[PDB]
From a paper:
Sirtuin 2 (SIRT2), a member of the NAD+-dependent histone deacetylase family, has recently received increasing attention due to its potential involvement in neurodegenerative diseases and the progression of cancer. Human sirtuins (SIRT1–7) are currently the only known class of histone deacetylases that require NAD+ to catalyze the selective deacetylation of lysine in histone and non-histone proteins. The catalytic region of sirtuins consists of a Rossmann-fold domain, a zinc-binding domain and the loops connecting them. The interface between the loops and the two domains form both NAD+ (subdivided by the pockets A–C) and Ac-Lys substrate-binding sites.
Herein, with the aim to elucidate the binding mode of this prototype and to further improve the inhibitory activity, we initially solved the single-crystal X-ray diffraction structure of SIRT2 in complex with 3′-phenethyloxy-2-anilinobenzamide, which revealed that 6 is located in the selectivity pocket. The inhibitor binds to a highly lipophilic pocket localized at the interface between the Rossmann-fold domain and a small domain adjacent to the C-pocket of the NAD+-binding site. The binding mode analysis of 6 revealed that its phenoxyethylphenyl moiety is surrounded by Phe131, Leu134, Leu138, Tyr139, Pro140, Phe143 and Ile169, which leads to the establishment of π–π and H–π interactions. The 2-aminobenzamide moiety oriented towards the acetyl–lysine tunnel exhibits hydrogen bonds with water molecules HOH3, HOH4 and HOH11. Of these three water molecules, HOH3 and HOH4 are stabilized by a hydrogen bond network with the side chain of the catalytically active His187 and the main chain of Val233, i.e., the key amino acid residues that stabilize the binding of the acetyl–lysine substrate during the deacetylation reaction. Closer evaluation of the superimposed SIRT2 structures revealed that the amide group of 6 might occupy the same space as the methyl group of the N ε-acetyl–lysine substrate. This result prompted us to take a new perspective toward targeting the substrate-binding site through the functionalization of the benzamide moiety in 6 to mimic the acetyl–lysine interactions, which afforded compounds 17–19, 26–28, 36, 41 and 42. In the field of SIRT2 inhibitor design, a milestone on the elucidation of the mechanism behind the isotype selectivity of SIRT2 inhibitors has recently been reported by Rumpf et al., who discovered that the novel drug-like small molecule SirReal2 (5)32,33 is able to induce a rearrangement of the SIRT2 active site by creating a binding pocket, called the “selectivity pocket”, which is responsible for isoform specificity, suggesting a potential common mode of action for selective SIRT2 inhibitors. In fact, the “selectivity pocket” is the pocket that accommodates the long chain fatty acyl groups. In this study, the binding mode of 6 on SIRT2 was elucidated using X-ray crystallography.
Author numbering: 34 to 99, 111 to 288, 313 to 356
Amino acid sequence: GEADMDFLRNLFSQTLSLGSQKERLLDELTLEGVARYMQSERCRRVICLVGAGISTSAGIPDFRSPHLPYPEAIFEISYFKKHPEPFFALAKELYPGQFKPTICHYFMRLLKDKGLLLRCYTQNIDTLERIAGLEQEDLVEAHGTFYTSHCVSASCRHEYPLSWMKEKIFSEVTPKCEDCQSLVKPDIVFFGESLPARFFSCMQSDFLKVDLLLVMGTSLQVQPFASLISKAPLSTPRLLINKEKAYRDVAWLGECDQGCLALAELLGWKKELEDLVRREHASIDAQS
Ligand SMILES: NC(=O)c1ccccc1Nc1cccc(OCCc2ccccc2)c1
Ligand SMILES: [Zn+2]
């Protein structure tokens, strides 16, 4: 009761000092304020921007981590169209023994299920967002993905699923297009290739009406998202969940999974989320 009054005193004092130009929508710069903000009528659109940190607990590191000219050519598109073998050998070595999304991936599934997710911008090619159930339209796979692959020939472009590529990779035979006999390349954005065009219209408009940015497993100031993030309105709250003046920023520094759990609990979804995760994990265990 005196705490409720103190809560108002702090809110009034922090907004008074902010001053004249900036607008603060969070009633408190905490995970709690963010939960209340996302449970309010103002929060209709949420965009998640995620990186590697949300996959560490699922055991899949970024693959760029540590006769071929320089080490990097294995990541270059033109070197790939001429010498595909090195890449596919590495792809075999690094192929994940499992695809089990994390609590954080499923938290995003809840956002989508509750009609709250405008889009999930990801730097991961690991495919977990799709396994957790996010669809093509909910995503902008910025470094591309190994989920699908295509024939390199412009007048063919035959698509192939992971099933088909996995088999090739472990058999150590170079994937060829059944129709045009041309190479079949994973839809990863190789060095030299570019982010596909339709994603630009997302970037150019999604950030205009976003009500909340959830940045997880990657940092706020690092390019390239930093530039995507800077297109959001200045009043747009941003919650950062990553391992290691302010009026519209809140930070949860710790493991991405524990963070999504604390937020889900504050929203009363903890149980529903832990149920989704147990279920899918068993449902994935029974496929293989
Ligand atoms: N962003 C990247 O990691 C990347 C960028 C350009 C070129 C290659 C890249 N990744 C890469 C390069 C070599 C092998 C590899 O591992 C592939 C295994 C895999 C990928 C995605 C899903 C499941 C398995 C990934
Ligand atoms: Zn083809």
